[PDB]
PDB file of all heavy atoms in Angstrom:
ATOM      1  N   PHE A 171     -80.018  35.777 -63.347  1.00 35.26           N
ATOM      2  CA  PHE A 171     -78.658  35.599 -62.811  1.00 35.26           C
ATOM      3  C   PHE A 171     -77.998  34.261 -63.004  1.00 35.26           C
ATOM      4  O   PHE A 171     -76.904  34.104 -63.558  1.00 35.26           O
ATOM      5  CB  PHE A 171     -78.539  36.122 -61.331  1.00 35.26           C
ATOM      6  CG  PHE A 171     -77.131  36.063 -60.746  1.00 35.26           C
ATOM      7  CD1 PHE A 171     -76.148  36.991 -61.397  1.00 35.26           C
ATOM      8  CD2 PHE A 171     -76.843  35.356 -59.735  1.00 35.26           C
ATOM      9  CE1 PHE A 171     -74.819  36.965 -60.869  1.00 35.26           C
ATOM     10  CE2 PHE A 171     -75.521  35.289 -59.202  1.00 35.26           C
ATOM     11  CZ  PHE A 171     -74.491  36.198 -59.764  1.00 35.26           C
ATOM     12  N   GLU A 172     -78.648  33.233 -62.318  1.00 38.52           N
ATOM     13  CA  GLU A 172     -78.107  31.892 -62.365  1.00 38.52           C
ATOM     14  C   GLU A 172     -78.163  31.383 -63.696  1.00 38.52           C
ATOM     15  O   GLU A 172     -77.534  30.287 -63.919  1.00 38.52           O
ATOM     16  CB  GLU A 172     -78.966  31.093 -61.408  1.00 38.52           C
ATOM     17  CG  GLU A 172     -79.024  31.560 -59.982  1.00 38.52           C
ATOM     18  CD  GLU A 172     -79.870  30.770 -59.087  1.00 38.52           C
ATOM     19  OE1 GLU A 172     -80.570  29.703 -59.563  1.00 38.52           O
ATOM     20  OE2 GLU A 172     -80.146  31.004 -57.870  1.00 38.52           O
ATOM     21  N   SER A 173     -78.753  32.030 -64.718  1.00 40.02           N
ATOM     22  CA  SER A 173     -78.797  31.722 -66.068  1.00 40.02           C
ATOM     23  C   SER A 173     -77.599  32.319 -66.819  1.00 40.02           C
ATOM     24  O   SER A 173     -76.914  31.519 -67.465  1.00 40.02           O
ATOM     25  CB  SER A 173     -80.116  31.993 -66.772  1.00 40.02           C
ATOM     26  OG  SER A 173     -81.150  31.273 -66.196  1.00 40.02           O
ATOM     27  N   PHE A 174     -77.426  33.518 -66.848  1.00 38.56           N
ATOM     28  CA  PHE A 174     -76.351  34.110 -67.685  1.00 38.56           C
ATOM     29  C   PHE A 174     -74.911  34.005 -67.090  1.00 38.56           C
ATOM     30  O   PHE A 174     -73.906  34.297 -67.821  1.00 38.56           O
ATOM     31  CB  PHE A 174     -76.702  35.608 -67.932  1.00 38.56           C
ATOM     32  CG  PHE A 174     -76.311  36.471 -66.778  1.00 38.56           C
ATOM     33  CD1 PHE A 174     -74.990  36.872 -66.503  1.00 38.56           C
ATOM     34  CD2 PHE A 174     -77.258  37.125 -66.066  1.00 38.56           C
ATOM     35  CE1 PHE A 174     -74.573  37.618 -65.505  1.00 38.56           C
ATOM     36  CE2 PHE A 174     -76.934  37.983 -65.013  1.00 38.56           C
ATOM     37  CZ  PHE A 174     -75.618  38.234 -64.711  1.00 38.56           C
ATOM     38  N   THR A 175     -74.786  33.611 -65.841  1.00 40.78           N
ATOM     39  CA  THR A 175     -73.501  33.481 -65.256  1.00 40.78           C
ATOM     40  C   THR A 175     -72.994  32.011 -65.435  1.00 40.78           C
ATOM     41  O   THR A 175     -71.848  31.766 -65.080  1.00 40.78           O
ATOM     42  CB  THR A 175     -73.487  33.762 -63.676  1.00 40.78           C
ATOM     43  OG1 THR A 175     -74.666  33.197 -63.130  1.00 40.78           O
ATOM     44  CG2 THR A 175     -73.308  35.168 -63.459  1.00 40.78           C
ATOM     45  N   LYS A 176     -73.863  31.160 -65.949  1.00 40.52           N
ATOM     46  CA  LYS A 176     -73.488  29.754 -66.204  1.00 40.52           C
ATOM     47  C   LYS A 176     -72.095  29.673 -66.858  1.00 40.52           C
ATOM     48  O   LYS A 176     -71.901  30.053 -67.894  1.00 40.52           O
ATOM     49  CB  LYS A 176     -74.530  29.198 -67.189  1.00 40.52           C
ATOM     50  CG  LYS A 176     -74.933  30.102 -68.349  1.00 40.52           C
ATOM     51  CD  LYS A 176     -74.098  31.277 -68.687  1.00 40.52           C
ATOM     52  CE  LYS A 176     -74.162  31.459 -70.171  1.00 40.52           C
ATOM     53  NZ  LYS A 176     -73.566  32.679 -70.677  1.00 40.52           N
ATOM     54  N   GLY A 177     -71.249  28.949 -66.122  1.00 41.84           N
ATOM     55  CA  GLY A 177     -69.886  28.599 -66.552  1.00 41.84           C
ATOM     56  C   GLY A 177     -68.853  29.800 -66.502  1.00 41.84           C
ATOM     57  O   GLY A 177     -67.705  29.577 -66.834  1.00 41.84           O
ATOM     58  N   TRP A 178     -69.270  30.977 -66.033  1.00 41.80           N
ATOM     59  CA  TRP A 178     -68.377  32.126 -65.961  1.00 41.80           C
ATOM     60  C   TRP A 178     -67.884  32.136 -64.627  1.00 41.80           C
ATOM     61  O   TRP A 178     -66.640  32.000 -64.242  1.00 41.80           O
ATOM     62  CB  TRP A 178     -68.996  33.416 -66.499  1.00 41.80           C
ATOM     63  CG  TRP A 178     -69.475  33.443 -67.772  1.00 41.80           C
ATOM     64  CD1 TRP A 178     -70.598  34.156 -68.314  1.00 41.80           C
ATOM     65  CD2 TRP A 178     -68.980  32.743 -68.956  1.00 41.80           C
ATOM     66  NE1 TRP A 178     -70.803  34.014 -69.640  1.00 41.80           N
ATOM     67  CE2 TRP A 178     -69.711  33.029 -70.026  1.00 41.80           C
ATOM     68  CE3 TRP A 178     -67.941  31.808 -69.101  1.00 41.80           C
ATOM     69  CZ2 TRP A 178     -69.583  32.522 -71.343  1.00 41.80           C
ATOM     70  CZ3 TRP A 178     -67.720  31.317 -70.434  1.00 41.80           C
ATOM     71  CH2 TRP A 178     -68.569  31.701 -71.454  1.00 41.80           C
ATOM     72  N   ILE A 179     -68.794  32.436 -63.627  1.00 44.66           N
ATOM     73  CA  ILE A 179     -68.440  32.540 -62.208  1.00 44.66           C
ATOM     74  C   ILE A 179     -69.223  31.442 -61.535  1.00 44.66           C
ATOM     75  O   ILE A 179     -70.286  31.024 -61.983  1.00 44.66           O
ATOM     76  CB  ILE A 179     -68.885  33.835 -61.586  1.00 44.66           C
ATOM     77  CG1 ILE A 179     -70.458  33.895 -61.419  1.00 44.66           C
ATOM     78  CG2 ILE A 179     -68.455  34.919 -62.516  1.00 44.66           C
ATOM     79  CD1 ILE A 179     -70.991  35.219 -60.681  1.00 44.66           C
ATOM     80  N   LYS A 180     -68.629  30.790 -60.488  1.00 43.19           N
ATOM     81  CA  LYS A 180     -69.268  29.808 -59.722  1.00 43.19           C
ATOM     82  C   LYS A 180     -70.009  30.358 -58.529  1.00 43.19           C
ATOM     83  O   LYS A 180     -69.344  31.043 -57.696  1.00 43.19           O
ATOM     84  CB  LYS A 180     -68.204  28.754 -59.322  1.00 43.19           C
ATOM     85  CG  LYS A 180     -67.147  28.425 -60.415  1.00 43.19           C
ATOM     86  CD  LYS A 180     -67.774  28.002 -61.652  1.00 43.19           C
ATOM     87  CE  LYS A 180     -66.788  27.600 -62.748  1.00 43.19           C
ATOM     88  NZ  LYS A 180     -66.027  26.416 -62.309  1.00 43.19           N
ATOM     89  N   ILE A 181     -71.247  29.868 -58.417  1.00 42.30           N
ATOM     90  CA  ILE A 181     -71.938  30.352 -57.220  1.00 42.30           C
ATOM     91  C   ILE A 181     -71.724  29.407 -56.025  1.00 42.30           C
ATOM     92  O   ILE A 181     -71.966  28.255 -56.104  1.00 42.30           O
ATOM     93  CB  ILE A 181     -73.537  30.335 -57.573  1.00 42.30           C
ATOM     94  CG1 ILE A 181     -73.871  31.252 -58.668  1.00 42.30           C
ATOM     95  CG2 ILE A 181     -74.307  30.631 -56.339  1.00 42.30           C
ATOM     96  CD1 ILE A 181     -75.332  31.239 -59.133  1.00 42.30           C
ATOM     97  N   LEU A 182     -71.103  30.011 -55.082  1.00 41.99           N
ATOM     98  CA  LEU A 182     -70.641  29.170 -53.896  1.00 41.99           C
ATOM     99  C   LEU A 182     -71.846  29.052 -52.852  1.00 41.99           C
ATOM    100  O   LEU A 182     -71.865  27.984 -52.201  1.00 41.99           O
ATOM    101  CB  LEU A 182     -69.591  29.857 -53.141  1.00 41.99           C
ATOM    102  CG  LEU A 182     -68.358  30.260 -54.150  1.00 41.99           C
ATOM    103  CD1 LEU A 182     -67.176  30.875 -53.274  1.00 41.99           C
ATOM    104  CD2 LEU A 182     -67.858  29.010 -54.801  1.00 41.99           C
ATOM    105  N   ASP A 183     -72.723  29.977 -52.806  1.00 40.43           N
ATOM    106  CA  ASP A 183     -73.794  29.880 -51.934  1.00 40.43           C
ATOM    107  C   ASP A 183     -74.709  31.162 -52.116  1.00 40.43           C
ATOM    108  O   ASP A 183     -74.387  31.981 -52.712  1.00 40.43           O
ATOM    109  CB  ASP A 183     -73.342  29.865 -50.442  1.00 40.43           C
ATOM    110  CG  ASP A 183     -74.286  29.271 -49.473  1.00 40.43           C
ATOM    111  OD1 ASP A 183     -74.302  28.038 -49.257  1.00 40.43           O
ATOM    112  OD2 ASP A 183     -75.039  30.152 -48.835  1.00 40.43           O
ATOM    113  N   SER A 184     -75.990  30.831 -51.617  1.00 43.81           N
ATOM    114  CA  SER A 184     -77.051  32.032 -51.818  1.00 43.81           C
ATOM    115  C   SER A 184     -78.027  31.818 -50.654  1.00 43.81           C
ATOM    116  O   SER A 184     -78.161  30.712 -50.141  1.00 43.81           O
ATOM    117  CB  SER A 184     -77.746  31.858 -53.100  1.00 43.81           C
ATOM    118  OG  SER A 184     -78.552  30.765 -53.176  1.00 43.81           O
TER     119      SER A 184
END
Side-chain angles (χ1 to χ4, degrees):
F171 183 63
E172 303 177 0
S173 292
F174 81 72
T175 40
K176 37 27 140 165
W178 299 150
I179 75 175
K180 316 308 183 64
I181 295 176
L182 307 182
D183 199 84
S184 66

